[PDB]
Amino acid sequence: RHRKVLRDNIQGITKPAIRRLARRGGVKRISGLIYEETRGVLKVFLENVIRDAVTYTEHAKRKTVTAMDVVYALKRQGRTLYGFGG
Amino acid sequence: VLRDNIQGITKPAIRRLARRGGVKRISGLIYEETRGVLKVFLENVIRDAVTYTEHAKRKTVTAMDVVYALKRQGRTLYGFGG
Amino acid sequence: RKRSRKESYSIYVYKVLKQVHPDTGISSKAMGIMNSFVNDIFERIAGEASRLAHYNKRSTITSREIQTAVRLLLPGELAKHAVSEGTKAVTKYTSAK
Amino acid sequence: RKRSRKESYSIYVYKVLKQVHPDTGISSKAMGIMNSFVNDIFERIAGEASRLAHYNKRSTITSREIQTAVRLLLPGELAKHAVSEGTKAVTKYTSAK
Amino acid sequence: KARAKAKTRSSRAGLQFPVGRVHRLLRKGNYSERVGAGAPVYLAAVLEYLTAEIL
Amino acid sequence: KARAKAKTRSSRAGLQFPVGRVHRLLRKGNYSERVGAGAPVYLAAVLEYLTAEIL
Numbered sequence: 001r002h003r004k005v006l007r008d009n010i011q012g013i014t015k016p017a018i019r020r021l022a023r024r025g026g027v028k029r030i031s032g033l034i035y036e037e038t039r040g041v042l043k044v045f046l047e048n049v050i051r052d053a054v055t056y057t058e059h060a061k062r063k064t065v066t067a068m069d070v071v072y073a074l075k076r077q078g079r080t081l082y083g084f085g086g
Numbered sequence: 087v088l089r090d091n092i093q094g095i096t097k098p099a100i101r102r103l104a105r106r107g108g109v110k111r112i113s114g115l116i117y118e119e120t121r122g123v124l125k126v127f128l129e130n131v132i133r134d135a136v137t138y139t140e141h142a143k144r145k146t147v148t149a150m151d152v153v154y155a156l157k158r159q160g161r162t163l164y165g166f167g168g
Numbered sequence: 169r170k171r172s173r174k175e176s177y178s179i180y181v182y183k184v185l186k187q188v189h190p191d192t193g194i195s196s197k198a199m200g201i202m203n204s205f206v207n208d209i210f211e212r213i214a215g216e217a218s219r220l221a222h223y224n225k226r227s228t229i230t231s232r233e234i235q236t237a238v239r240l241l242l243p244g245e246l247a248k249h250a251v252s253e254g255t256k257a258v259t260k261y262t263s264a265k
Numbered sequence: 266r267k268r269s270r271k272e273s274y275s276i277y278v279y280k281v282l283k284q285v286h287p288d289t290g291i292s293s294k295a296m297g298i299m300n301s302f303v304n305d306i307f308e309r310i311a312g313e314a315s316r317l318a319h320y321n322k323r324s325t326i327t328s329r330e331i332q333t334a335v336r337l338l339l340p341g342e343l344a345k346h347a348v349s350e351g352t353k354a355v356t357k358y359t360s361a362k
Numbered sequence: 363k364a365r366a367k368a369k370t371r372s373s374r375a376g377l378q379f380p381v382g383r384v385h386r387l388l389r390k391g392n393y394s395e396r397v398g399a400g401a402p403v404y405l406a407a408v409l410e411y412l413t414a415e416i417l
Numbered sequence: 418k419a420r421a422k423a424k425t426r427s428s429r430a431g432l433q434f435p436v437g438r439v440h441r442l443l444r445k446g447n448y449s450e451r452v453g454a455g456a457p458v459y460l461a462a463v464l465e466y467l468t469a470e471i472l
Binding site for chain 6 (some may be wrong): 282284286299303307311314315319326327328346350351352353354355359361362
């Protein structure tokens with residue numbers, strides 16, 4: 001058998017979920033090639049933020065990533081986040 | 087005769103700038119809109135500049151005020167000190 | 169029995185809310201939002217004031233510097249009204265010692 | 266006879282330039298550019314270090330914090346080579362007291 | 363001594379937001395070496411007005 | 418006393434950028450209360466490397 005669920009990866013971010021997301025942005029009609037590209041885009045964003053978060057985590061000699069690290073890592077990219085402390 | 091002075095930013099100079107930006111062909115209506123856009127940018131900067139100016143109780147605008155006001159709008163500028 | 173102590177701006181936000189809309193409540197998440205918002209604005213203003221001070225080789229942050237930073241960061245009419253409140257506050261505080 | 270004193274990083278840049286390309290000069294404007302560049306990077310790194318320290322409730326800025334800030338601000342290979350140079354410098358400084 | 367009873371600086375300012383906590387936060391936080399008495403009142407007032415507008 | 422002759426910290430580092438001026442700039446600038454000896458050497462090396470790359 002070969003499942004590895006659909007890639008054991010980003011492909012669990014299913015199509016209709018992206019559809020709902022595009023619906024939030026007011027969009028009506030989407031092409032079939034969008035999905036994959038969006039996924040790649042998402043990955044890049046996450047990568048950068050997570051990297052920074054992990055780096056903050058590494059400075060405190062912890063093995064648990066806290067919310068605060070995510071907040072700060074987001075703040076440095078100009079995407080400050082409210083509602084989780086800081 | 088003077089013409090609100092925004093007209094000192096003439097057509098051919100704007101054409102030249104657009105040429106530096108890779109533009110080949112320009113409609114006639116661009117000019118007015120561009121002028122307005124330019125005005126807005128300047129206004130914001132100078133406001134901040136003058137604010138820094140007002141804080142020192144000086145009457146002479148210095149480069150540093152402009153540099154700071156530019157820095158705070160996310161358009162940091164190099165080559166005039168600081 | 170060991171116990172810590174985390175401060176916030178909650179209680180004060182609650183007071184203000186009861187002043188402006190007596191028959192209205194507010195959830196914990198939103199209060200957290202307001203807490204983070206207050207912290208963010210505080211940080212911006214203090215940092216900007218610091219930068220102004222350092223640029224003019226003055227070692228004291230005063231009301232003047234705060235006023236300046238407010239005019240820089242905020243736009244227009246919001247700045248004017250807030251500045252009004254600040255000036256009124258200083259005038260009241262300085263008199264009734 | 267009254268006279269001031271404005272410091273800059275000019276001379277050090279000149280040394281570096283002669284080290285890397287002996288038969289080459291540089292104009293004043295570009296030297297000013299390099300001066301501004303240096304000051305900007307210095308400000309970013311120190312500011313970020315400060316923010317890291319304040320977030321972990323440590324009141325000392327050490328080499329560790331700088332190293333972390335560098336890994337945060339700069340991307341990839343530039344960071345790796347820079348970090349290596351810095352580590353080498355610390356290792357040389359600490360030994361030859 | 364007399365030890366006049368202490369009212370809060372907030373109560374002198376006629377404000378609800380605090381002052382003393384703000385002063386402490388300005389001292390700890392590497393913003394300046396010294397802080398003048400007037401600053402935190404101004405700052406607190408600004409915060410109050412913004413918070414009132416939002417709510 | 419002996420008063421060994423003072424070589425620069427830069428020379429100990431084998432660098433061309435300075436160190437002492439950086440130390441002063443970190444003390445004045447409200448970045449932290451105290452600064453450790455290792456930091457400015459690290460920062461100096463970083464500045465020199467970047468400068469060399471650009472030139």
